[PDB]
Write a protein that binds this ligand. Structure first.
Ligand SMILES: Nc1ncnc2c1ncn2[C@@H]1O[C@H](COP(=O)(O)OP(=O)(O)CP(=O)(O)O)[C@@H](O)[C@H]1O
Length: 413
């Protein structure tokens, strides 16, 4: 279909490799390195297979096309990468231009080079904001030059940046080398998602959680065409409960736009035979705070208002468990409560326990990136589910049935 790294001859070749090293940070300290580790297999393969160089490029955060070295440098990533790889990483303070080109022209065999944040240049995204905060547009000649420069850095191109595969950015689709190969991470991610979406083992359970409904309509709709069961949890559930069940939800999140289509979505489900599991009980809070006073409510009792519901309750966890038990395949995108806070994490943790249990008995368990992946780190379960995705937005696009420009741009095999 598409050329992949396993099929690519890299011996004695400089490999310029787009990766997603857009890792969570604080005070320029990396807080989850999951994205970095995820790329190691492609990098090692290249090295073990005689690549002259591997030049790594990524964005970090949204500097919006202006240099932000004290907020968004990849320098910390170069440090973490050397540790993961047990090899030196040469960090360049830029990604394009004559000095970087000189550095990458003919490196000593086995050289690993990490470029500075691609997004310090407006050319990468093709638009951005000026240093005064005004929206600005990249210029075509400059974009071409930007792409040309990156292109100079390797003989062959590999994209392992699954997390960025939804972005038609210069580094992702604009590289002007004839051989453009998907990396092992890109391959792995797509395989699990394809199987899940094209050819699932059944029953196929989707667990969708999150705050709002409006932004998930395509996703729910598409998933309803694929799955056998769906759990809808988190903040989004209140919209369904209020509309469908007449529930009193207090101050819990309510999506007015979403409420308009909830019925239509449930109709599709019924028509398709998809069993919907909504929460039946809740952990309530008197305010939206980590340390709020908490209570308990049922759909029938209502949320006494305007208290808000911030986790599912024990009976919900039981129904969720029952669904998990039924499943031979699961895709989980979204926590079922405010997992960030211990008083409202219980539902999420229990579900994680169930998902882990399912994996141990052969359930194919796919965790969407973003918050759900974060939970995997938090509770140390990355090696206990089948797949923890590195791409939240990207994975969501696939789940919505969308094409990834980063994949499309690869060479055909
Ligand atoms: N019952 C509930 N009430 C309010 N918020 C809830 C909730 N259950 C979960 N959440 C919150 O939902 C958040 C995730 O929701 P959402 O739909 O906004 O994804 P998101 O904010 O990650 C989109 P983006 O990718 O831009 O960050 C988590 O931060 C969690 O605290």
């Amino acid at each position: 279909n598409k050329l992949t790294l396993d099929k690519l001859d890299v011996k004695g070749k400089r490999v310029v490799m787009r990766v997603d090293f857009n890792v969570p940070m604080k005070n320029n300290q990396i807080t989850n390195n999951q994205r970095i580790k995820a790329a190691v297999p492609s990098i090692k393969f290249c090295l073990d297979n005689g690549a002259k160089s591997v030049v790594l490029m990524s964005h970090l955060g949204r500097p919006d096309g202006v240099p932000m070295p004290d907020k968004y440098s990849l320098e910390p990533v170069a440090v973490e990468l050397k540790s993961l790889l047990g090899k030196d990483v040469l960090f360049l303070k830029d990604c394009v231009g004559p000095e970087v080109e000189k550095a990458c022209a003919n490196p000593a065999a086995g050289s690993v080079i990490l470029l500075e944040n691609l997004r310090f240049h407006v050319e990468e995204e093709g638009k951005g904001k000026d240093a005064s905060g005004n929206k600005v547009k990249a210029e075509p000649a400059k974009i071409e030059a930007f792409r040309a420069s990156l292109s100079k850095l390797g003989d062959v191109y590999v994209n392992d940046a699954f997390g960025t595969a939804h972005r038609a950015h210069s580094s992702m689709v604009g590289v002007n080398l004839p051989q453009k190969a998907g990396g092992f991470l890109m391959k792995k991610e797509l395989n699990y998602f394809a199987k899940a979406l094209e050819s699932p083992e059944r029953p196929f359970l989707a667990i969708l959680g999150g705050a709002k409904v409006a932004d998930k309509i395509q996703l729910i709709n598409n998933m309803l065409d694929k799955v056998n069961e769906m759990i809808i949890g988190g903040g989004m559930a209140f919209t369904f409960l209020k509309v469908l069940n007449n529930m009193e939800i207090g101050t819990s999140l309510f999506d007015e736009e979403g409420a308009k289509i909830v019925k239509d979505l449930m109709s599709k489900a019924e028509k398709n035979g998809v069993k919907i599991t909504l929460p039946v009980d809740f952990v309530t809070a008197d305010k939206f705070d980590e340390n709020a006073k908490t209570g308990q409510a049922t759909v029938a009792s209502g949320i006494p208002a305007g208290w808000m519901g911030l986790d599912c309750g024990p009976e919900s966890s039981k129904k969720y468990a029952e669904a998990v038990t039924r499943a031979k395949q699961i895709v989980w995108n979204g926590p079922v409560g405010v997992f960030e806070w211990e008083a409202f994490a219980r539902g999420t943790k229990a579900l994680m326990d169930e998902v882990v249990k399912a994996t141990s008995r052969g359930c194919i368990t796919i965790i969407g990136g973003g918050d759900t992946a974060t939970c995997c780190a938090k509770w140390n379960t990355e090696d206990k589910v089948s797949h923890v995705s590195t791409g939240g937005g990207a994975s969501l696009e696939l789940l919505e049935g969308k094409v990834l420009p980063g994949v499309d741009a690869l060479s055909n095999i």
